Design a protein around this ligand. Sequence first.
Ligand SMILES: Cc1nc(C(=O)N[C@@H](CC(=O)O)c2ccc(Br)cc2)c2cc[nH]c2n1
Length: 167
Amino acid sequence: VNSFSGYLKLTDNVYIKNADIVEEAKKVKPTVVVNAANVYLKHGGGVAGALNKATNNAMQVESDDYIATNGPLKVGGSCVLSGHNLAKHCLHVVGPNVNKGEDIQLLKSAYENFNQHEVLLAPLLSAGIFGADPIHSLRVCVDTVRTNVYLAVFDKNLYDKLVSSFL
Ligand SMILES: Cc1nc(C(=O)N[C@@H](CC(=O)O)c2ccc(Br)cc2)c2cc[nH]c2n1
């Protein structure tokens, strides 16, 4: 039993809710919140910009130190950093950005990072400003993640389409 409330169960291990991931994180304080990161951990917009704003820029400060030490992530890769006031940990995961020409096949590799964590709150990788089809992102998630994932979908119209079209 966990504290996530109001989610629709899609499969044995995947759940979904029309919600703002920032407000969901602040309420639940999950062990892991997933960020829709880029390889530079520049959290300027989308989910990343919103999550970073909620930490009063502390996420960006920590991220800049991480990059100065380690260099950029790989597309499809991840790193674990602090969750600040939102969660114990933040798993920064880099899905492919279609608006940069990146291979959509890397979306499966991106979701594989979730399997290193028993329970996560997450957005649909490569959705929103990353330019991929959210229906596809959801299919890859369900077919790749085996741990317990709670998906927060900001847009109500998109959430209804994702539910109504789910096989
Ligand atoms: C769960 C959650 N999702 C986002 C978000 O940016 N969602 C994108 C998708 C994406 O970026 O993955 C989207 C927004 C509108 C339309 Br129409 C289509 C896609 C934010 C932003 C602040 N809080 C958030 N909480």
